[PDB]
Amino acid sequence: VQKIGILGAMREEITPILELFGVDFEEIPLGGNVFHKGVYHNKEIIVAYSKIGKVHSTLTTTSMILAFGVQKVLFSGVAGSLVKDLKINDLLVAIQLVQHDVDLSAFDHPLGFIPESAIFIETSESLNALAKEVANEQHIVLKEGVIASGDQFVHSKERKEFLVSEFKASAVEMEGASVAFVCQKFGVPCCVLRSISANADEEDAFLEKSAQTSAKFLKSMVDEL
Amino acid sequence: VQKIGILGAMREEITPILELFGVDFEEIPLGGNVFHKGVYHNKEIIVAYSKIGKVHSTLTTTSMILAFGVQKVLFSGVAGSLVKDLKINDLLVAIQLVQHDVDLSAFDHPLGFIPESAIFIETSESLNALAKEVANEQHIVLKEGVIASGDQFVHSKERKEFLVSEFKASAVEMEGASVAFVCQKFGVPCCVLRSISADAFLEKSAQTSAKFLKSMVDEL
Numbered sequence: 287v288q289k290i291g292i293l294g295a296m297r298e299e300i301t302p303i304l305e306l307f308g309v310d311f312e313e314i315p316l317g318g319n320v321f322h323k324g325v326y327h328n329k330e331i332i333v334a335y336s337k338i339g340k341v342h343s344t345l346t347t348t349s350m351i352l353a354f355g356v357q358k359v360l361f362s363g364v365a366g367s368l369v370k371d372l373k374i375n376d377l378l379v380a381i382q383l384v385q386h387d388v389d390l391s392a393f394d395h396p397l398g399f400i401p402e403s404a405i406f407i408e409t410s411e412s413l414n415a416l417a418k419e420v421a422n423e424q425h426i427v428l429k430e431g432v433i434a435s436g437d438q439f440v441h442s443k444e445r446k447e448f449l450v451s452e453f454k455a456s457a458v459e460m461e462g463a464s465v466a467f468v469c470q471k472f473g474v475p476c477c478v479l480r481s482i483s484a485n486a487d488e489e490d491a492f493l494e495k496s497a498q499t500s501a502k503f504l505k506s507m508v509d510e511l
Numbered sequence: 512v513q514k515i516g517i518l519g520a521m522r523e524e525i526t527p528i529l530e531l532f533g534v535d536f537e538e539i540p541l542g543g544n545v546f547h548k549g550v551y552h553n554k555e556i557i558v559a560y561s562k563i564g565k566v567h568s569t570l571t572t573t574s575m576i577l578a579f580g581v582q583k584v585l586f587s588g589v590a591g592s593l594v595k596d597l598k599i600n601d602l603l604v605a606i607q608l609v610q611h612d613v614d615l616s617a618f619d620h621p622l623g624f625i626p627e628s629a630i631f632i633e634t635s636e637s638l639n640a641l642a643k644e645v646a647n648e649q650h651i652v653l654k655e656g657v658i659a660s661g662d663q664f665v666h667s668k669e670r671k672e673f674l675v676s677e678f679k680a681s682a683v684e685m686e687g688a689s690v691a692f693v694c695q696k697f698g699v700p701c702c703v704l705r706s707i708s709a710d711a712f713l714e715k716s717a718q719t720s721a722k723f724l725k726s727m728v729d730e731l
Contacts, residue, residue, distance in 0.1 A: 317573070318627075318696040338625050339613060340662075341569050341689045345696060348542070348573040387612060388564060389663035400563050437565075437662070438614040464566050471543040471570065489617070 291356030295363035343461035365457035365480035387436035410475035431456030435463035516581035568686035590705035608688035612661035635700035656681030660688035
């Protein structure tokens with residue numbers, strides 16, 4: 287029985303996901319999270335809001351995997367662009383991610399690095415390839431890049447410039463890296479998709495449209511699994 | 512069947528705990544961690560190191576609870592002092608913990624606050640009182656205070672003074688708050704104990720902490 291996890295990074299991103307799949311979803315409370323469980327064409331689909339920041343999103347992902355047995359994870363949301371050519375409404379697949387706020391440079395480690403780990407987190411080759419195929423089929427341009435995540439909102443010119451110089455990041459948000467990290471640790475293929483909600487020089491109804499567009503893209507992925 | 516989780520931040524702290532409990536531990540890999548499962552006087556003891564930082568420690572704690580059913584968590588480690596009265600080798604129990612690096616101030620949230628949470632995370636009355644009781648019986652001084660945790664190793668005067676001024680923290684490390692938070696979310700009692708550190712120091716400190724943890728478990 288195939289079991290697929292779907293995360294969104296705002297509560298309001300969940301509604302159009304559950305609506306579009308169209309089946310009944312049972313609400314299961316666990317660890318202060320609510321997981322929505324439904325059956326769609328003989329796959330179990332487990333949908334949750336991550337909650338904010340890395341500790342929340344780690345907890346929700348680890349829970350999803352251990353309590354519900356999800357075998358693959360798709361994580362949708364929005365991100366702010368760090369690069370001129372990545373603009374509002376562009377869709378981005380995260381080929382790698384980084385925890386941009388990790389700093390053990392006092393022990394001469396490169397920024398982003400933790401011992402017994404690595405700076406960059408890898409996502410699923412097969413799921414990213416699937417996202418490319420779906421984007422081709424649906425006539426949606428799909429860009430690729432590195433997403434930086436950290437437990438601060440990044441707004442300053444200096445901090446955005448640091449993300450690009452240090453990590454070659456394309457976009458920034460708060461929960462992607464941690465989710466991808468957990469998945470990788472459990473051998474669970476993960477795909478992290480972001481649509482751009484702010485241009486690189488910048489810091490609601492528009493997020494309602496993005497959340498609908500994302501739900502459509504997620505369903506078109508699941509329809510291929 | 513009582514199930515107790517014992518967490519250390521780093522590998523060298525585990526070794527002495529496994530040896531002192533003395534029982535046969537089964538090694539169970541899960542989520543890139545190795546959990547050591549043993550039965551000690553009719554209590555199941557699950558021992559693991561987190562690895563460093565908030566993601567790692569949140570992952571490990573959640574696994575302890577969901578995969579192994581632990582009912583109570585004891586977390587031991589070292590921490591750096593932020594106040595003159597906490598000196599090297601002092602033992603501190605964390606009454607509250609904060610994630611000091613969380614900053615949603617761009618949206619007028621206080622520093623350390625995340626929506627659906629709180630700035631300060633609480634720990635177990637009962638387990639804290641047990642730590643105090645063990646310490647009193649053995650004539651070991653046990654200090655109490657707030658622990659600040661974050662994904663940076665804090666070394667500057669400016670950041671240390673920020674921790675004191677913003678959170679009234681007494682000590683700083685990288686994993687306490689995330690472990691305590693996970694336990695709170697699952698209604699699992701948690702005790703966070705830290706020896707003040709500022710390789711050879713660490714060996715002694717791990718042996719003495721293993722003895723203190725064993726002493727607590729003997730009362731549970």
